[PDB]
Symmetry: D2
Subunit: 339 residues, 4 copies
């Protein structure tokens, strides 16, 4: 009684390899309504459906510059069905530009009882049905975000095991519906934890994640990993260098992530665009053996300059800013980026 | 960082003890739309909302004899807001007859990929919000049905641990919202597994369930257990007597269930009403030490006679039959029942 | 594939019941060579083999009415073959006095790598052969001492799971050789952890212990539990009354320990004779339901007085002191002892 | 509080890299007294130190053309203390020639109670001190053999997790004493299991093994993996090509073994020398990305022809046979071997 047939396995592996093809990354446009409301009010734009649609169309309808740059674009539930002003659907736009359609299938994080500010992620209800719907709607990969806080007694064993179990359930459902699941065990940089503590926490979290994936019979070749870079806390007084951070991140992935994983798509995790790009370039320049596609999956690290150059006015300046950021991060993913 | 405050624990314990009082059991009137349609077509009548309401009136609205025999009555999401033809809502009817309202908070059994027909339960999305709503609507306890099946390799480790984790999440959410969680780790009596194989499977399942409850900081004095009686599969050819079936069940509970659990409300997996009642009588007549209230949580084994004596035509005969069955099950819970 | 046959289970249950018969406790005379050297240099006398034989001489051969007070005595490998100077060996002495022989089968605690002062224990090598030998030598129950310390990040998940695993292996081997295994998850009282922290740690440790016992197919009716009293640290400022200590300890046991366990034989904790006795008396006076034999298993909490009165007396004064202590402790176990 | 300081980590990684330097495998010269008696009686000679030491000297003392062929040699306690014809200790004989000295630190397998013919390896008692002694004696790496059998209900969860726990304990102790631990989760080819079933079982076993290693804070860069080739059972009717065997084995390693592992040193598992060599060559010729040193750790697959050509003549022909077998196996581990 296998989980998937060879046809499903081949399809999932093909989708994952298309997503993490050399030099290709992920554009994280899956900002929920509240997050994008904060992003738009940071520049003064009002959070309306039309403004959201126009901003996401400005992001997605970029040029041949980002054509061989973005392996896949992840959208939201609303963004999947929205149409560009040209009249073409957003998944169709992404596919025409050579990308792969993705969608966040989270329902937000909920508190865990008995632990110090630790949250597990929900969204498993009807996930099979709505993942089949998204697959029919052009989506090929999904995203599940689980956050883990480094604190005095966190990430606790309960939070770690629960998040790993929930991620494995998400991945099982997505692979059963033909959707490539991107497992994101987010570890928040909020805190004073140093690089060594962050590396230890990432190692433990990813170990539990991959044990859960093995337990749930997840086809690892048809999955992607979306972990944060091993970085110090936001309150960390001790400054760690770029190559040191890259070595820590690559080592943490090496000690845990089996090579069957098609590729690793990092996140900015609240760091600046240039810092994220140089960190990814150093990671791909690490003098170790890294048997995955160490590529990027950036949100604000791709959108901050675009939003600043946009400001809400109805375009090509913001598009060019996003294009150059995407090109820089592609060169970082290829190891040939200069800050 | 505790899970519940002393006041929360005290009120949950009060609700639990009010549920499992000496003699008082649980009426499982939480038949979903499909199950109630199947029962109504078994008696031949049409499946309508008014037909369901009339069934619920037939069950809940009764005489003063049912009052000191039924501790709590669990309803459906629909039945929670339905009102009796008199005008009083069903939760207020249940409270007026001395009972306590219950709500089924499941969302079905989604299959587990990679397993031999093993299904995990869903319904955790928005469970906190809807449990707060149910608590405001009069519901003081919930129920979560997890299905495990004794096959040739099942219940597998994945199925057991996943169902235990899901039940623990359900229980944590319910206790956070002030609702007593009835954890029901159903092991289906489908197959030819002998009595002692059923005992072994039940022992493993309950051990995993209570380990998960401990890991999720579940206040066990504020929860109830709803397992099956340790019984052979319907295809088993060895016939085990009532006293030895009771011995097996009580031993299985004694080896896994900690005494903190206020009460064990037993389910009846296809048992006849009389057979389930005599099984409960034997269980409560077991010479071993049972530190829990071994009451009933019967559904079909409580209202099959009601269905037969009702037929669908608009009543008191079915009411009296249900009263007979409820009194028999109360005497069985008190260990003073005879056929 | 049952671990034990019905005859094996019956024998183990008989041994356990004889161990924890009403009012019958345990004397922990299993001090190792170094431990008894320190305990005898506390009075300053000596270490030599014969003079330490003379300790067990007056410990076991003291009165003729300690039979209804102490039911079993844990000895050492050395003490097993040591003889009373009259010619009778100590196992036969304890049998003649109505007791049952026990032997500690540890090999000391060893450090766990990567953690903060957490030590797992050895003794599993050749344990089957030496347990068969001890059964041939009259030993009917064993002992395993796993230590866990409460600190800033302790007991860790690794230490808890490893100690539970080694305890379960010990129990499996002992039950396979017909020896009743006493699982002792010693949670060391050093530190400043409060009562609530101690109770939480004890609950977690016992939950993992009993999950491991279930995983290793441990016959719980043929086992005993030897946990500590739920007591604060040596440096906890808050003063907790005896009945409150008892309520916490009994609640921690009820929340975890399944009723199948024959009895709970508490630890001395390194505390005073009178206060330990009244603590046990309060535990047996707790207004809850305790489905075990909450008896005593004390070392220095029965020895210190008979040590001060002995100091190398070559006798009856220390014999009488230990006898009066054991009588008071049996009275406490029966919930009758008055300080 | 890390398990190892950076100096210890560097030393362990250096030892591992020396062990699996390109083109170098491992000679599994270790044999318990019973196993070596069985071999020497199969060739017809007697089993005393006389022939045992001469056999070990035959194996280790060899031609200079085997120097880049064998990276490490796993020995026994006796063979560690035995000397060669020169009067020189076998550890030193292996050293200064290129080989790293290794010793099996098992104390045999002990049956697990409650399961169907499943065993756990013992040897943890005194492992720290005796590994320190082995380091003093020239040994730089160890070997631990855990046996898992594919059956109707096996490998059970208890057996898998217990073997992983004892392997992780062994590895932590060895890394504490500076010994590089070779984690060997043997899965017996005994049975009729299909190649797919063998791959599934190997996948689960390796996932559990590496989860345990992560839980015990094992430094993966300073460890070696010694798994069997994913091969059918002894009675599997379907014949599988060498390329198919290689693909299955490499896939099973990819899905579970993280890249931090310095190398993978397979075993014959009771197959012929030629079959083992061609299987290793196919594994190293697999068209996948394998971030480990896939080499050989062979016993009979390196010693059977040598022993048959020796027969107790007291030698050059046996030396030549073993040397040519080792040369073929090194060419296979380099991926450049043809019959």
């Amino acid at each position: 009684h296998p989980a998937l047939t060879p046809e499903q396995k081949k399809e999932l592996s093909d989708i994952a390899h298309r997503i993490v093809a050399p030099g290709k990354g992920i554009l994280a446009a899956d900002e929920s309504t509240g997050s994008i409301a904060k992003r738009l009010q940071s520049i003064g734009t009002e959070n309306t459906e039309e403004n959201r649609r126009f901003y996401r169309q400005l992001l997605l309808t970029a040029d041949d510059r980002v054509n061989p740059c973005i392996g896949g674009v992840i959208l939201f539930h609303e963004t999947l069905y929205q149409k560009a002003d040209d009249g073409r659907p957003f998944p169709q736009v992404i596919k025409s530009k050579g990308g792969v359609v993705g969608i966040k299938v989270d329902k937000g994080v909920v508190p865990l009882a008995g632990t110090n500010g630790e949250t597990t992620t929900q969204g498993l209800d009807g996930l099979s049905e709505r993942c089949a719907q998204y697959k029919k709607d052009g989506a090929d990969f999904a995203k599940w975000r689980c956050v883990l806080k480094i604190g005095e007694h966190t990430p606790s064993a309960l939070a770690i095991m629960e998040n790993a179990n929930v991620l494995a359930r998400y991945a099982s459902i997505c692979q059963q519906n033909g959707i490539v699941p991107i497992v994101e065990p987010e570890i928040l940089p909020d805190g004073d934890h140093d690089l060594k503590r962050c590396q230890y926490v990432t190692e433990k979290v990813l170990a539990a994640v991959y044990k859960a994936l093995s337990d749930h019979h997840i086809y690892l070749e048809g999955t992607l990993l979306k972990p944060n870079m091993v970085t110090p806390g936001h309150a960390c007084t001790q400054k760690y260098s770029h190559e040191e951070i890259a070595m820590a991140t690559v080592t943490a992935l090496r000690r845990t992530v089996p090579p069957a994983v098609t590729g690793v798509t990092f996140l900015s995790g609240g760091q600046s665009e240039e810092e994220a790009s140089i960190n990814l370039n150093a990671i791909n320049k690490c003098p170790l053996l890294k048997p995955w596609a160490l590529t990027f999956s950036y949100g604000r690290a791709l959108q901050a300059s675009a939003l600043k150059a946009w400001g809400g006015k109805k375009l090509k300046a913001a598009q060019e800013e996003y294009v150059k950021r995407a090109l820089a991060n592609s060169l970082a993913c290829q190891g040939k980026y200069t800050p």
